[PDB]
Design a protein around this ligand. Structure first.
Ligand SMILES: [Mg+2]
Length: 279
């Protein structure tokens, strides 16, 4: 992978490789996402979940949420990629976390970036000021918060108000992805991924991890692509047979737009290369 990276870098063909992936990426219908009754549940008109892989809310009237299940068969890893919650979809977001039995939520953006709101403040900021989502009958409480230099980890408690059952959720918040471009080094991003792994949030004893940024495709795609490639390098008899382009195209069968720029594609290669040297 490193020799391939050096060749693409020296030939200046990141844009060409990226455009070939965009050209060959799967094109599946998103009929449910485009229904008029779901207009207020979507953040960007160009980012919708495919019907075949969308997560359904266990709701009789409207089961729609902009979220997709990415199921990586060989790696035995699943992820739910979703948009950053909207002011009216926070209850739906936490209903999905509850119903899917997720242990972790991975957030790759700040609430405000470039002076604009990228997602609703969907979790409580103080222990004593819990949030109640009346539409989905859930209460959410901040249990603890550990602020580090490149990321913050929070323990949240989700309570189903109907039964009074509770579930503990870990919120992994990468707070240092630059407003423009990608990080210069993948070191902090890889340390973040390893901290998510260590928590058990990506493990098969739990529901799939819920990952989002604003659209849930750019930085979200880089997170899952790096994690899956590293797992395959550890599992395979020939780790050099792991082709990041092929893994990305496989992921793109489940949600559109994963990796939004040639810069993110180059960053994903860099994170996999540096991650493999570490592992
Ligand atoms: Mg306090």
């Amino acid at each position: 992978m490193e020799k391939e990276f050096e060749q693409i870098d020296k030939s200046g063909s990141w844009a060409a490789i990226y455009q070939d992936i965009r050209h060959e990426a799967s094109d599946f219908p998103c009929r449910v996402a485009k229904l008029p009754k779901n207009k207020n549940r979507n953040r960007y008109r160009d980012v919708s979940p495919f019907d075949h892989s969308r997560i359904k809310l266990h709701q009789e009237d409207n089961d729609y949420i902009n979220a997709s299940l990415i199921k990586m068969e060989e790696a035995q890893r699943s992820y739910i990629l979703t948009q950053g919650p909207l002011p009216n979809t926070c209850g739906h977001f936490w209903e999905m976390v509850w119903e899917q039995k997720s242990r972790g939520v991975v957030m790759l953006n700040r609430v405000m970036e470039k002076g604009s709101l990228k997602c609703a403040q969907y979790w409580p900021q103080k222990e004593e000021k819990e949030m109640i989502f009346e539409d989905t009958n859930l209460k959410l409480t901040l249990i603890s918060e550990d602020i580090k230099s490149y990321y913050t980890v929070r323990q949240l408690e989700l309570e189903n108000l109907t039964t009074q059952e509770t579930r503990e959720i870990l919120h992994f918040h990468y707070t240092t992805w630059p407003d423009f471009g990608v990080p210069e080094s993948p070191a902090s991003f890889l340390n973040f991924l390893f901290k998510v792994r260590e928590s058990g949030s990506l493990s098969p004893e739990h529901g799939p991890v819920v990952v989002h940024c604003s659209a849930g495709i750019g930085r979200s795609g880089t997170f899952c692509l790096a994690d899956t490639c590293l797992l395959l390098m550890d599992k395979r008899k020939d780790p050099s047979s792991v082709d990041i382009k092929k893994v990305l195209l496989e992921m793109r069968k489940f949600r559109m737009g994963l990796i939004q720029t040639a810069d993110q594609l180059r960053f994903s290669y860099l994170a996999v290369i540096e991650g493999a040297k570490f592992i």
